[PDB]
Design a protein. Sequence first.
Lengths: 340, 341
Amino acid sequence: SVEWKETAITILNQQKLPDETEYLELTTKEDVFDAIVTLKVRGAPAIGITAAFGLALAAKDIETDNVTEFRRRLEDIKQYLNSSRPTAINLSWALERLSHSVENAISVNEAKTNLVHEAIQIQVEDEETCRLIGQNALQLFKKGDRIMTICNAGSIATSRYGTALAPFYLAKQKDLGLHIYACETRPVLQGSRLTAWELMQGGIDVTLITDSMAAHTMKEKQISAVIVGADRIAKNGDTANKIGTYGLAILANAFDIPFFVAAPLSTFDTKVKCGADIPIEERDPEEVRQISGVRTAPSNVPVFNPAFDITPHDLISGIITEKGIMTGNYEEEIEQLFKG
Amino acid sequence: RSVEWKETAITILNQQKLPDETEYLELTTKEDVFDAIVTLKVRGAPAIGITAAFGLALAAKDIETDNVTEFRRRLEDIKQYLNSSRPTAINLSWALERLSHSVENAISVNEAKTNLVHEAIQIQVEDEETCRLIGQNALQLFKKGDRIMTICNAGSIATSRYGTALAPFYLAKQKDLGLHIYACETRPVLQGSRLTAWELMQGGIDVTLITDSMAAHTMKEKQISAVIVGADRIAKNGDTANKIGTYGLAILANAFDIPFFVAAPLSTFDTKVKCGADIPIEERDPEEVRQISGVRTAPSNVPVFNPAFDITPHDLISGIITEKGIMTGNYEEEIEQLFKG
């Protein structure tokens, strides 16, 4: 979904799926700003990745020889791409990675080839963390069980395999007759437009359901467990995910059904105490008032449009990263985990 | 108005056209009634019955028979034809069962042929008064300036007028009390963002739209004070069957500890069952979950699960509101010591 050409970045326009597989050639630091706010590219990690190739690109365009000045401008761009979308850290996390990869550059020309290797490197280890999460999480389910998910934490949300979908892809070979239930994550339908398309495009047993049906499906389909990705995880353990995730957790807990949050180490924010202090992005009201040019509610009806909710660690049965499975006491587990 | 009986035609508002359009239709055939109902041009537990009833009567028109028992004899074929439209709502059953019972001791084909129309009008108006009564009955449950959340569209176009769950809001507007209602779009058919948001707006009712996937978060962030929905069929023990999505609002509600309320006219009841788990949950066309108003949202061919209703077990309901009053505890007996007559 994200591919780098030292001249530009070609991204799969995620808005179009499942209808068309369009590719756009982002070449300007503003073409990237837009690709993000506009959701042409989404998924905490994939988003972090393009953010990086963004600075990595707008930088060659930077003219001069003063390393100190170069880094002044570089910072304005970083604050710009970062102002794009909040709630997930993967964005500013990848940005930091880069603006530090040049805290001791002697020249500029190097610092420019520096940023790129970093960005190209951030993307390489994304395949690695995902393959791991796919493999660490699969330990949780067995042959036969039907698992639910939300949003689209798959191949195009990351680099490959994904986080919460990763195990499905793996359970496939193993021939684990895993039956998935994906919810059409409204309003942006990242679930019916991406998660159904992808999993089907790979021969996984998916079944699409509206967000509402969540509970009825849990009862009459005997859901076995729930796994979702993340956008930001606090020291506390509280996790920030697609609007709707919280409801499934509290709803899942009622059915005493396992709630898993699959997410990379880069999705954690050690600086933040709990979830309640994680800024939730509210997007354009029209995301709820119309779709593909067709109005679905009174044009001026007031709307509450939050993109993410928070799931208190009290609701999480386990957390999966490239390191393993911290099934509880996520406060401490993380301080241990975190190091370097 | 919702459903209008002429003496040779039923005029329904095409609800699948809203919110951008308000077109009406001239139903003439029992074929036309069957369609409208099944394709949701007309929906809402009561409105449905109002139509099935009227429709049946318009049917019993173009049917020649000197005989009374020959008229009745084949007069089910119609009842059955329509009753086989949509399963879940117990109002379509109830509303046909009534019409077929009020011609039992009919002495002439023209008598019944004419009693039916009177019966179907008896039913519509009765509803208005019972919607007006539930409205008042339920308004006692909310203080002023509180945030209520609903699902589906149990209002005036779903009923003859006033509604059941929405009733209390029109009335609150009257007594002027700061009610802010939160309507979840209610997918797949979207009667929430399309029907509810649109009428409450007309009536200057303070409304805010949210996708179904925002129940929980809105509950915490917005501090919603209560929840109110409206059945399609209630079981002899409190177990209510309402539009898909209600069961979770119930579970969530319980979790946030806020009152969950059901508003249903007496007819929306079905004492002849022991619980909801035994209530026929309709399942509609898959392409309903695969798109949004013509716009394909998912890859066609993607397997879909599409139940139209779910079941909220009585011990999750903080109270049921009827035209006769409120019930707060043992529903099984209360429900029993009511249909007593």
